[PDB]
Amino acid sequence: MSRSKVFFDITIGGKASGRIVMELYDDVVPKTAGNFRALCTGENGIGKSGKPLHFKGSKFHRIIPNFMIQGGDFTRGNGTGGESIYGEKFPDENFKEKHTGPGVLSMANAGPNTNGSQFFLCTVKTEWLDGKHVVFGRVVEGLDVVKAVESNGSQSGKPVKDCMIADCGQLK
């Protein structure tokens, strides 16, 4: 069983900013990887929310310099929403992988066992999140695109302009 590869094509203020390619750890956290993979392809259609279970057209709603970029709220666009393919929330699968540096892909949450569709891409090592957020992949191409998004964040977390997942999907 091979690791999944998925991508985001990003726009910033409407402008094409390049592609982020991510490898998922299907071998370590199959359920969590599987959720994200299906959210990139959109293959499970319309969610309980009545909105597509799909990152396409969603934004990075929370961006903090020297920390991480966060998105996946395709129901409310503000961090209050999101939906996993399994339903509103699913448990923390395991904490085997750690937040070891820039490019780590990990699940956002509201406390233990509240995984939905929100995720973050780290721009630094964030070891204080180890054991609290489930790490399920890594950037393998486009870290510069992550940095471009990061430059539009604020300490407050509010973006200075819309950083959108203009397209997404699974590769190979």
Ligand code: PRO
């Ligand atoms: O949004 C935040 O600040 C925390 C840290 C990353 C995921 N949740």
